[PDB]
Amino acid sequence: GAYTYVSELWRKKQSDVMRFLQRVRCWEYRQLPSIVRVTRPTRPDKARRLGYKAKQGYVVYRVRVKRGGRKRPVPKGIVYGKPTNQGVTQLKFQRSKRSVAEERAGRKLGGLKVLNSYWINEDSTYKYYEVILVDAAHAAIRNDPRINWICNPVHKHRELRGLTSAGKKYRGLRGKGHLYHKNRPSRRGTWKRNQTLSLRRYR
């Protein structure tokens, strides 16, 4: 009966209490490495609603990522091509920052499975997320019908294939209908289907 209070308070991010707490937390996070384990989530309710459980085999990692766009990584900012492609700055990565955080956690922790993640803090230079990971080899995980699906081989490195919630968001899959149809089953799959020249036997 307490999680609703926490959620409502975390919806008030401009309140004095939240501003003070977030300022202290952001300072503390700035002093620590980019990827570090946290003993327990600092947002219990959000973790629950994203699938976390307080049982063995569940872990949470805080991930720090840099803010801003993606400068084209060409030497001296020189592009050999037509003017349309000569832009260097003001270019944007097609993936979101939380997706980058999940990828960094997954690559660093190759023996675990990324389940979900959530925003926690941010400053002008850094954005912070906590990633929920699952030790698929633990007996507690393997004996829990609600989560042991992650143990199957088809879910290997979900974060690196865009299969997480952030992955579905940046792949254009969070909507349906006339505004999103080109994204299913995938944008490239749709392109291949549309470009195919069908030559039947009896033409």
């Binding site: 020249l197 030559l199 036997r201």
Partner: protein
């Protein structure tokens, strides 16, 4: 380009030769699908090969609203009216669609009658051979049970018929074109008329 020809617009400027799909496997696909159907029929014996019963629904848009076809599944309202619990319908060969709304009495009544006909035509084996429950059938009915191959309840249109009727004076004095024109005018000017009425 030369002569008087239609302006060409062939879309062949990409690497289209790498995206050509041929149909040399068409007979193989037909054979594979037939084999799958036969295996499924053997598996689900003696359940009908046509699958679960489907509702009767109207075609969408003005082009097909006169047409009747098969829908995904029976609505919750139709199942309630027919007395079939929604959790039981799927297990006895009745498709269920919790999304479809019922806006008119005609469609709901048609689907309720369809469900009643299916119930009258349905034979249910007991879960255990020696135990007979409320919904189970009698031994005589069970003995003469066979698998139906084709569609057991075709969804068919009532074929048109031209009848001879008396032309009364009321019909002979009806101006269809005038009625259509005046209705169009009213639809066009309803907004202006309402604005004027509100002003005055």
């Amino acid at each position: 380009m030369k002569h008087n020809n239609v302006i060409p617009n062939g879309h062949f400027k990409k690497h289209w030769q790498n995206y050509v799909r041929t149909w040399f496997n068409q007979p193989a696909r037909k054979t594979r699908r037939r084999a799958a159907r036969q295996q499924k029929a053997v598996k689900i014996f003696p359940r009908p090969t046509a699958g679960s019963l489907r509702p009767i629904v109207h075609g969408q848009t003005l082009k097909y609203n006169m047409k009747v076809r098969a829908g995904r599944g029976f609505s919750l309202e139709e199942l309630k009216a027919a007395g079939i619990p929604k959790k039981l319908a799927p297990t006895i060969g009745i498709a269920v669609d919790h999304r479809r709304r019922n806006r008119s009495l005609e469609g709901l009544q048609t689907n309720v009658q369809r469900l009643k006909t299916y119930k009258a035509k349905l034979v249910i084996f007991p879960r255990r051979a020696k135990k007979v429950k409320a919904g189970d059938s009698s031994a005589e009915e069970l003995a003469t049970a066979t698998q139906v191959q084709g569609s057991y309840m075709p969804i068919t249109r009532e074929q048109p018929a031209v009848d001879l009727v008396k032309v009364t004076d009321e019909m002979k004095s009806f101006n269809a074109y005038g009625k259509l024109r005046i209705e169009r005018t009213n639809a066009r000017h309803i907004g202006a008329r309402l604005k004027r009425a509100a002003e005055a």
